[PDB]
Structures are given as C-alpha cells and as structure tokens.
Amino acid sequence: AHFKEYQVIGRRLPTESVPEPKLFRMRIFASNEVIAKSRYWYFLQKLHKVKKASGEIVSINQINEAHPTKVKNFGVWVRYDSRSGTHNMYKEIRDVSRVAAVETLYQDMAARHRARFRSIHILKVAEIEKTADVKRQYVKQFLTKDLKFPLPHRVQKSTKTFSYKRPSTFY
C-alpha cells in the first residue's frame, strides 16, 4: 500500500540479571504496522543477537512529514541485491514527503535494476533544500532560476470510441 514512515522502538526481553535493556529504535518505511514490526525484527536480527521470540516491541508510531506541501530534495542511500551481488547506491529525487520519495525509490529500483522490495535496504533517507548538496543532473535541471517548459504534443483522452474531428495536440 502507501508507504508510511513508522518508528519502531523495541528491546530484548527483560531478564532478572538485565532489567531495562538497551531500547533500540528504527525508522522503517512500510505499508502497515504488521509489516512495520516484521521489517523491524528483520533488521534488528541483522545488527544484534536478538530475534522476535527473545524480544519485545515497546512502541510503534507513525512519523508524519513535517510539511507535506513543500517540495524538497531527498538524498537516498540504498543497498540492494542484484542477481550477481550486492551494491550500495546513492540516488536522489524530488518530492513533498519522505514516504512518497521512498515509494518513488522502490519504483525506480524495480524499473532500473529489477530490484524487488525483498532485495532493497533503505540505508538513509536524507532531506536537503540547499543546492550544491545535489549531485545528480537529473535533479539539478529543475533547480535553474525561472524554470518554465511546455508540455508538447498534448494527447487528450476520449470518453467515446468515436470522435468527429481529427485531434489537436496544441497546448
């Protein structure tokens, strides 16, 4: 579904010798809470000696975008598995939210490298609104002062199967 940024705070189960464990937290983009808690145990199993059975999740929360109607430059660092091996890349994309850029990121990763969600780890989603922090020319071109372009060859959708005049693609 629509990716939602969840904060997931969990810990290892409290034993007698070690009450109050170290309370690790992650921000993971997921469709829903069930996948959020699942993705949490998957990564926390990767960085620590803990699995779902031996730990508990102490807080699950949604993080909302601070201002969902300002467009920003998002610096995305990702590792993914291709058929041959593993690679780390830094991509970047315009958006208004962290989540929709991550939705965009998974679409681009699937399209350009045939990477399924199973294969992708989102290392760090970073926002910058200051130029010269933007490295990719496919994003720099929308930051030129006084941007303006046409939308040539406008194709208009037809509700009916027949029309009674050749179409016009003017704009």
């Binding site: 109607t69 467009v71 303006k148 046409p150």
Partner: protein, 136 residues
C-alpha cells in the same frame, strides 16, 4: 528582410501558471502552479478557488492561457493575496473557455419544462433568422 520564423509559443508550465483540475476531488477548479517538482508533477494551490495545496501530476490538470506574478514556493496565504490582486479568477470567468463550461453545466441542469422552453425559443429564432437570409 526579417528572418521570418513561425512564432510557435504555447502554454509553458511555470510557477504562477493557473491550471484547471480536470479529475479528482476538485474536478473543474482553478489552482495556481506553486512550485515545479518534476517534468510531470508539480505543486499546486487553489485557496481562493477551493483546491488544497497538493502534489499532482501535470496529466491530472490542464494548463490555461492565464498566469500571474507569484513568487516560487509561496504558501496558501501569499498565493491567495496574489490571486485576488491579479483577478485571475475574474479573467478566467470572462474567458470563452469558462463560458462553455458554464453553458455546459447550465444546459445540463435544465428541467423538462425549461427544455420545452428552449424548443419554442429555438423555433422562434429559426423563423426570424431563416427569413433574414432569404431577404438578403
């Protein structure tokens, strides 16, 4: 002799270009383009007209001939101030494009009585105009 070139200037998408939302919750409202996001998406706002600030594909709106001076990235408050002073809402209404939309909706709302009233008036108008061609 001047190097004649067909002018060929047409409806560029830019900050401050007013657009019509053709599908969605708005479906027929005005909104100024507030900030360019990509080649096919853009941030728009229709506060005076009644469209919330949102991201939207350029294929979900149709650009219009009109625009006004609107600084890039202005929130709903600054956009509505510049929208009012430019009378872009009024200029759209006086345009022929809006008159066809208003004519379309007004004709659709016509009742069965009002449709019969059209029928009589159209026969009357045809009688005088057909007479007018015959004499000259």
């Amino acid at each position: 002799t001047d190097s004649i070139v067909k002018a060929s200037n047409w409806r560029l998408v830019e900050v401050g270009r007013v657009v019509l939302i053709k599908k969605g919750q708005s479906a027929g409202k005005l909104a100024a383009i507030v900030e360019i996001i990509d080649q096919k998406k853009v941030l728009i706002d229709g506060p005076k007209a009644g469209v919330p600030r949102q991201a939207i594909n350029l294929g979900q709106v149709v650009l219009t001939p009109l625009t006004f001076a609107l600084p890039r990235g202005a929130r709903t408050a600054t956009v509505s101030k510049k929208w009012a002073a430019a009378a872009v809402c009024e200029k759209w209404a006086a345009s022929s494009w809006a008159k066809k939309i208003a004519q379309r909706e007004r004709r659709a709302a016509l009742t069965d009585f009002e449709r019969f009233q059209v029928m009589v008036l159209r026969k009357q108008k045809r009688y005088t105009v057909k007479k007018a061609l015959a004499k000259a």
